Amino acid sequence: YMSRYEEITQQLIFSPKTWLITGVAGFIGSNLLEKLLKLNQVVIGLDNFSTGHQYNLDEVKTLVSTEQWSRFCFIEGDIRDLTTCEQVMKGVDHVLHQAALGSVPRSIVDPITTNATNITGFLNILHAAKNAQVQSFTYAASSSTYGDHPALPKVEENIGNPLSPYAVTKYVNEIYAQVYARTYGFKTIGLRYFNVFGRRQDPNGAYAAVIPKWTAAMLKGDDVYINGDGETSRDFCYIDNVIQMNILSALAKDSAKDNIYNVAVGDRTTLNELSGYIYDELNLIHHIKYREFRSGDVRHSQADVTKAIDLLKYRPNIKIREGLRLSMPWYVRFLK
Amino acid sequence: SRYEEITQQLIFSPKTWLITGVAGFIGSNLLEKLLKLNQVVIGLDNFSTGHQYNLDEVKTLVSTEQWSRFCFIEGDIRDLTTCEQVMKGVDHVLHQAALGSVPRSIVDPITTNATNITGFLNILHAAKNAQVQSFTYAASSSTYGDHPALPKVEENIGNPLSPYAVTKYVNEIYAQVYARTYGFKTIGLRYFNVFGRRQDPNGAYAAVIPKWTAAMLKGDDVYINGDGETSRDFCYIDNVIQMNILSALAKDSAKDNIYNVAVGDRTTLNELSGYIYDELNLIHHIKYREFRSGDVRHSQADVTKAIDLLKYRPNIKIREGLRLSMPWYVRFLK
């Protein structure tokens, strides 16, 4: 069970609130859209259809009641534009900010647009929220912030130098958030994600995350590439864990705010083991080439998640193996 | 001696310099020096906190031939196309364009962010793609933040205390990342409260020295935010010009590095009001309020790094600096 979460969701259903999800047509955003509409919350959504999709919002329509859906007001717009950020914050209680351009390679290839999206856009949204005097503010940080720090597991206090323009932007999100707490008393929570996966994560496009990437390759019967030696390790975290933690953070005690928390499970899968898992779970649904290391890459990733467990009563319920089983059906229906 | 050695070689084989923030306090002082060295100079400013009249002044201090190898473009660092075009044929970049003032950034962090981050990145990236010989940018002693140790060593850094402080720390991190992923080595200069000729005395954001000088001349109130025991390493302008040039022409091993630019002296605000007063009286010529929010408490540089790797010689200290600066202010404000 996820008791605290269970309690807070109950709390929400009785006294519903108005939420803003930026990046709401994206992977994590539309997943938050699902849960929040299933709790009868009023939700304002903001996306620009950069990496996000209309079909993800169309999917959530089929997944919820028409009554629940009529409380969703979606706005097409850009976080890089301040006035739209201000317009979108009117009467908002809780801010879940997921809008950004991900991908470490994307940021090497084009650090300028990545900067405007992930720094300027984050600040537009943060400032607008402080000005609107929202009840809470939660934003997507990253495990990439750990940079070249060698120790495992990864604790929130200890980071190294950033290895990618992507990492810089996300780290900058944290600095700004902390500084907003210092100067305005606006307390936020930053969630450092550790490779999230699950339903609605884009398998198409040159910048696809590894799990939906390999899944599409394996299904079609194409080559599956391993960047380096495959001993590179990750703490893959199924979406529902991220969903739990965003909501936990939005209704967190005040003393629990102005904090950074790892969002993961505490596990360590190498890229070799992962291929094996994505092979097995696709077999039971009835249907390898090594190259050089990706540049600006983090080597090993494993979260120490006890801070979230401690302060927020986070209870991670879904490990990678169970996560893949729940996700593979969705990907088959998607690429058929 | 190394600085004087360098400046001579510059006279003999002049290089092309890009100065961003050329119409501002530090930038215009760099202009005057470079033009006195017969350097080809390209200047970029948007006249935000800068001034056409600062250029006019430099024009009067330098011959008309030296003034003809100055190409000024009015424009904004926030626009990448202008950052790209201004890099044409450039040898050395001195990046000085930014919006200072901690209080400015508390009222309006979005605007401070756009210029100090977006604009900085714009100019970093263009120089990287232009393949210039060097890139040196203005960093800040503010990025020491809440770190209590004295003196201030480049390595030992605390939490930033303001939006302005963030932007200037971000400049360092991006510079580090560009060295990492693109092999483009830069130098960041942590300036420590610079003063001298052309530091704007007007407006709500004026630094202590020009502001206090202005008010003492006008008989207005002189305000000390808090203790008066709040302390700084006031750096005379000619020391900064020296570092900028030493950094522009560093050997490869001295690049991808950060340097404190200061003198190594600690001066309290109480002491400063006395010093400025002393120096104004010699040219034939106080209320306590609350601490300024997001202020750094004590600031004093250890400048041993710059001395070792860049052969820096901190020449002018507070007193001689004020004596050199005071006549400029009287003539200007009159």
Ligand SMILES: NC(=O)c1ccc[n+]([C@@H]2O[C@H](COP(=O)([O-])OP(=O)(O)OC[C@H]3O[C@@H](n4cnc5c(N)ncnc54)[C@H](O)[C@@H]3O)[C@@H](O)[C@H]2O)c1
């Ligand atoms: N996916 C991971 O494993 C992971 C890990 C760490 C951090 N994050 C962060 O989580 C957040 C969501 O990632 P995701 O996996 O859902 O990726 P995604 O690309 O599916 O979601 C991003 C969404 O933000 C929207 N967006 C981007 N720029 C925008 C703009 N300027 N204006 C309006 N909307 C904009 C996109 O259209 C998209 O809908 C991002 O901040 C990402 O950097 C993700």
Ligand SMILES: NC(=O)c1ccc[n+]([C@@H]2O[C@H](COP(=O)([O-])OP(=O)(O)OC[C@H]3O[C@@H](n4cnc5c(N)ncnc54)[C@H](O)[C@@H]3O)[C@@H](O)[C@H]2O)c1
């Ligand atoms: N003076 C100090 O005490 C001190 C200390 C540490 C760091 N710095 C930094 O040193 C640099 C020089 O500043 P200064 O002290 O000469 O102040 P200043 O205000 O006189 O100079 C700033 C110049 O940059 C220009 N500018 C601002 N935004 C611009 C933009 N977007 N596009 C083009 N031009 C723009 C302004 O018009 C002005 O000419 C800045 O980076 C400042 O933040 C100053």
Ligand SMILES: CC(=O)N[C@H]1[C@@H](OP(=O)(O)OP(=O)(O)OC[C@H]2O[C@@H](n3ccc(=O)[nH]c3=O)[C@H](O)[C@@H]2O)O[C@H](CO)[C@H](O)[C@@H]1O
């Ligand atoms: C540990 C870390 O910093 N994680 C962050 C990083 O994800 P990652 O870059 O870790 O996620 P990813 O799925 O892009 O890469 C995972 C690993 O798989 C490798 N790979 C990928 C595809 C392929 O076809 N073959 C292959 O070998 C890739 O080189 C990497 O080592 O950035 C993401 C944003 O996009 C998130 O912010 C993550 O938190």
Ligand SMILES: CC(=O)N[C@H]1[C@@H](OP(=O)(O)OP(=O)(O)OC[C@H]2O[C@@H](n3ccc(=O)[nH]c3=O)[C@H](O)[C@@H]2O)O[C@H](CO)[C@H](O)[C@@H]1O
């Ligand atoms: C130590 C530090 O972080 N220094 C940085 C910070 O300068 P500072 O903000 O320290 O420079 P400043 O000239 O604004 O003020 C210095 C001191 O003077 C005090 N004061 C000022 C005006 C007044 O009327 N009365 C009064 O008491 C002010 O509160 C502060 O304690 O930002 C500058 C650019 O903006 C530079 O980047 C400096 O490197």
